Paper text:
Unique to this protein is an extended α-helix that precedes the beginning of the Rossmann fold that is found in all SDR proteins. The individual subunits adopt a bilobal-type architecture with the N-terminal domain composed of Met 1 to Thr 201 and the C-terminal domain formed by Ala 202 to Glu 332.
The first structure determined of the oxidoreductase was that in complex with NADP(H) and [name]. The asymmetric unit contained a complete dimer. The α-carbons for the two subunits of the dimer superimpose with a root-mean-square deviation of 1.0 Å. The N-terminal domain provides the interactions between the protein and the dinucleotide. With respect to the [name] ligand, the cytosine ring is held in position into the active site by the side chain of Asp 212 and the backbone amides of Phe 226 and Thr 227.
Residue numbers in the entry:
A (entry chain A): 2 to 288, 300 to 332
B (entry chain B): 0 to 289, 295 to 334
The structure:
């Protein structure tokens, strides 16, 4: 409770004037039971009227109660076509996010993401939504290398590499989003996220940082199967949520934003080291690319959570 | 008239390639978008030899098209409903797509949705009815930013999500991905053929692709107008040569393969195409300045050559036959 409360209070202090340009907007969040979707719901519910599209209502209640949210101030739907009230802003978070799924089920990866993007843009256009935010991925930059990748950079994709299911589905989605904006004057923004971290992540999450946390707790040891020199950007999930909120507030027909914390670029080894020290174990061995996130800074956004707080909060949160 | 042209063409095909055409007699062949330029020519060449199934949006349109091109309607079965086809189909050739530039940019969303959904549907139909092989007609627009000559099937292009004109290539790219993925997960044999631009007889006067823009302007306006400087160079290929290349690929037994299909002997600037057409119709070419970015590109077509295919028709024959066919109709 206290971890989340301290975070809700810090956000409001730094940016409450912004969260305010959002008072009583009707906000639809798809994939709202998900990591990012649920943190957005938490932050915005009450101060606005929150509609949550999810595959399973009960799963939504359980997640929302766990992270200390008032279910009586969210309207949970399972069927887009039952939402009858007017909607001001849509945040589309719904997607399959398991890497395994991308290679095991590349057909459905494409079909699911394509179909949902289509359905939500159709819904948005028909409903004369004020703005739709589409959550995308740094995987859209594909091959591109550099320490300063801008939104106008563009990956290439082999059609015969099945792991491209997810980036190719997000690319076609992005194209549809821009298209609805140019054709119909529907306000849209795309946000390309690095990789979210911080409290409310679960022990079973298939991400390297959580593999390290799990392995330190269960095996009292973290094993690296390479030298771990690859560097990766991370950003606290609350700082993702606040960035999306800033984008929501910008009146602009079309825009693309990289969302990352440019202070966090860490090697896998260094990540393993700090996690191990935090859990009183050791790293043992058994034998890149950075986005420019300057654009988002121009809205007045800043990230509040550094890697160390994000890890402490995430670990402490799991333990309790 | 028309029929002399067509008969001569079919006889040449038989003389050169009757061997390969024969590897397919009595196969059950489903052609989607069969009323279109390439689909209908494939049907023309193949009906009689083999059992032809033609999926179209409108049966009478397909009847009328097939008779315009001197086909025998009693030797093909036309369907408007995929689900109403019962017989075990051996080979599917997927030809249905929107092809007009204007539609790509006025309707980018519908461009993507139509191509994606039709690809998905025909792949599910194929998988479900244990089809031997499916051939997917793709485009040299797949190569995106790739420039210059000798472009091989493994070369990969980049695409901007903010260029509305990418509706067609992004839709083909995601479809290619789908097609590869079905061959990798279900052991369905798939082929992708990346085509340049077909020309030749039985092109219709309302087509808005550039060759017909020129011909139709020549005839109606007594003048051809370019809207660009026309320095873009492209590859062209006679529609009957496209169809024979597709037939050679049909005969391959290969789990997955991508082929460039072009005539390496035909590479021409838009301008020079305009002037040569204007020579044939006794008009002038003019400009009104004030489309794709103005690249230049040639495909490596060695794989299809390797199967034993050659193109039979030169640019003058293709254009002459195309123009004469159009004069005879209207
Ligand atoms: N986490 C990141 O750093 C990150 C990075 C780049 C992009 N993104 C994108 O941002 C969005 C949110 O990510 P996240 O981290 O919150 O992901 P998450 O925790 O995996 O949750 C994703 C949400 O989508 C739903 N979903 C999953 N499969 C679905 C399907 N087949 N049909 C419909 N809904 C489905 C999930 O509902 P169920 O529980 O019912 O499956 C859940 O509500 C996604 O679009 C994701 O691709 C996230
Ligand atoms: N011609 C070329 O140089 C060339 C080059 C590259 C790629 N290709 C590909 O080759 C294939 C055949 O091209 P083509 O030149 O024969 O094209 P076409 O003459 O324009 O014929 C298109 C075919 O697709 C059908 N079609 C169009 N819109 C449709 C829709 N919304 N739903 C269902 N069917 C639809 C048309 O039927 P309707 O009468 O019902 O509209 C017709 O049967 C296409 O996939 C095309 O992208 C052609
Ligand atoms: N136990 C581990 C896990 C990851 N790694 C390194 O960390 C990188 C990122 O790990 P990951 O599991 O998130 O993703 P992949 O990029 O390996 O699919 C790996 O490519 C390895 O170089 C390691 O060295 N030892
Ligand atoms: N009337 C015309 C038609 C085409 N064009 C040029 O010819 C090219 C090919 O025409 P198109 O409409 O088939 O081609 P895309 O640009 O859609 O590939 C265009 O890109 C323009 O450069 C022209 O200058 N004037
Ligand atoms: Cl519902
Ligand atoms: Cl559209």
């Amino acid at each position: 409770n206290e971890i989340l409360k301290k975070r809700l209070k810090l956000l409001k202090n730094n940016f409450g004037t912004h969260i305010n340009k959002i008072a009583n907007k009707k906000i639809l969040i798809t994939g709202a039971n998900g990591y990012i979707g649920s943190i957005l719901t938490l932050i915005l519910h009450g101060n606005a009227k929150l509609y949550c599209l999810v595959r399973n209502k009960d799963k939504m209640i359980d997640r929302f109660q766990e992270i200390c949210g008032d279910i009586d101030k969210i309207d949970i739907y399972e069927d887009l076509y039952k939402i009858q009230d007017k909607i001001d802003i849509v945040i589309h978070c719904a997607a399959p996010t398991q890497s395994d799924f991308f290679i095991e089920n590349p057909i459905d990866t494409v079909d699911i993401i394509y179909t949902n993007t289509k359905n939500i843009l159709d819904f948005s256009k028909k409903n004369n939504v004020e703005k739709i935010i589409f959550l995308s991925t740094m995987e859209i930059y594909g091959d591109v290398i550099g320490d300063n990748i801008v939104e106008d950079d563009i990956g290439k994709f082999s059609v015969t590499n099945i792991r491209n299911s997810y980036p190719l589905a997000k690319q076609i989605s992005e194209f549809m989003v821009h298209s609805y904006s140019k054709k119909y004057s529907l306000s849209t923004a795309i946000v390309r996220l690095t990789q979210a971290i911080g409290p409310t992540a679960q022990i079973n999450d298939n991400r390297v940082y959580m593999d390290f946390i799990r392995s330190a707790i269960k095996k009292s040891q973290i094993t690296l199967f390479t030298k771990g020199e690859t560097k990766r950007e991370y950003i606290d999930v609350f700082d993702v949520a606040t960035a999306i909120i800033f984008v929501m507030c910008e009146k602009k027909m079309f825009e693309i934003y990289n969302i990352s914390n440019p202070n966090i670029f860490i090697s896998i080894y260094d990540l393993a080291k700090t996690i191990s020290a935090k859990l009183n174990v050791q790293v043992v061995f058994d034998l890149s690319r950075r986005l420019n996130s300057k654009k988002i800074y121009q809205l007045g956004w800043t990230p509040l959570f550094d890697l160390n707080q994000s890890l402490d909060d995430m670990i402490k949160y799991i333990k309790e």
